[PDB]
């Protein structure tokens, strides 16, 4: 548990439906959502691989569970069920205990995906932006659509806004 989901970001966004993780920017030009496509695609690939690993790693053979025994062979019968029930027990203890664990793991995975996304932009904005809580930032300068597009892309160009940000922050 990394403290990003149900942590410093209390709730999710219903309006951002085309991804799992995203940004919400607010400018003079306007406000808007933008899902992060790369992280969402990587997470989708991971979840798909996990589901396929759970599903397609059980290859069985043609068997016919079920045998007929008369009165004169009860031990025989009592052995057969001891096999059958036994197998069921194992599977019923594995599958039920399997899903649970991966469920937890999945709920950790998404959390990490959010947390890293919060860290990456932090390392990009530095002192040029101030954390206002709720897991997001307020800029010390004027960011147009180009600035926020660059922040989302991964190339903020910190030095260019450094001096105005310094002038506005030292207040």
């Amino acid at each position, epitope marked *: 548990l990394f403290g990003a989901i149900a942590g410093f970001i209390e709730g999710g966004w219903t309006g951002m439906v*085309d991804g799992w993780y995203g940004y919400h920017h607010q400018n003079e030009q306007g406000s*808007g959502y933008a899902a992060d496509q790369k992280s969402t695609q990587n997470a989708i690939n991971g979840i798909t691989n996990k589901v396929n690993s759970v599903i397609e790693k059980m290859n069985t053979q043609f068997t016919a569970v079920g045998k007929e025994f008369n009165k004169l062979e009860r031990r025989m019968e009592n052995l057969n069920k001891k096999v059958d029930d036994g197998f069921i027990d194992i599977w019923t203890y594995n599958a039920e205990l399997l899903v649970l664990l991966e469920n937890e793991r999945t709920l950790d995975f998404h959390d990490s995906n959010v947390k890293n996304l919060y860290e990456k932009v932090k390392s990009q904005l530095k002192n040029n932006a101030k954390e206002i809580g709720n897991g997001c930032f307020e800029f010390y300068h004027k960011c147009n*659509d*180009e600035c926020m597009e660059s922040v989302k892309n991964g190339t903020y160009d910190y030095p260019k806004y450094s001096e105005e940000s310094k002038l506005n922050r030292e207040k």
Partner: antibody
Amino acid sequence: EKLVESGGGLVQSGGSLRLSCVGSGFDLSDNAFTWVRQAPGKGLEWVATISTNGGSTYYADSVTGRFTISKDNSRNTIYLQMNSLRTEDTAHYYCARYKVCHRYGLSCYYYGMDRWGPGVEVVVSS
Amino acid sequence: TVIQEPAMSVSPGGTVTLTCAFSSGSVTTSNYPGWYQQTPGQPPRQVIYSTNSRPTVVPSRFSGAISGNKATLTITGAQAEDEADYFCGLYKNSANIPFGGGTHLTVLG
């Protein structure tokens, strides 16, 4: 299910246009849309896209900050407001509708565009 | 980026193939290679979506597949109404679908 495009023409450099596309035969509330352009002597280039509910919006790196794609569900219309047009914006513009895909509860952009529009020729000059 | 061939030709009733490849990589089924047909004066039409899936309306002369890390569109028995520009749209982890330059198929008459 057809898309009809309109609102383009000859505009001066530094001006603005508002291309509009009207869809007849379906509802826009559950489909994602895109605007694509073909420059003269060049291949098809992605311009902008809007999600199913209109919340998410993505722009090409060359037209960011100048183009705004919006959706009006009441009129069944998709608008591309183009501002501060430059000479490189001369093209033929198509409005296309993304095919419906649903991956783990999320809307997709995998399969491409199923319904395109006839296109509108936008030319700028000085 | 996506690379196609500038122009190709086919005689009527002849089978032709159009290729679509990345400039610096390979094209797999996860790229969802779509094929769009564009005639002059009319909207482009999605001939192929996904690797091989074809819409009902589209004739069955058009089939597609991934061969040699390259998407391919095969037209078996090219009629006279298949003289258009064919564009290949690939998927790269975003709504930004890169398109090919275009291939002008000339049905010789």
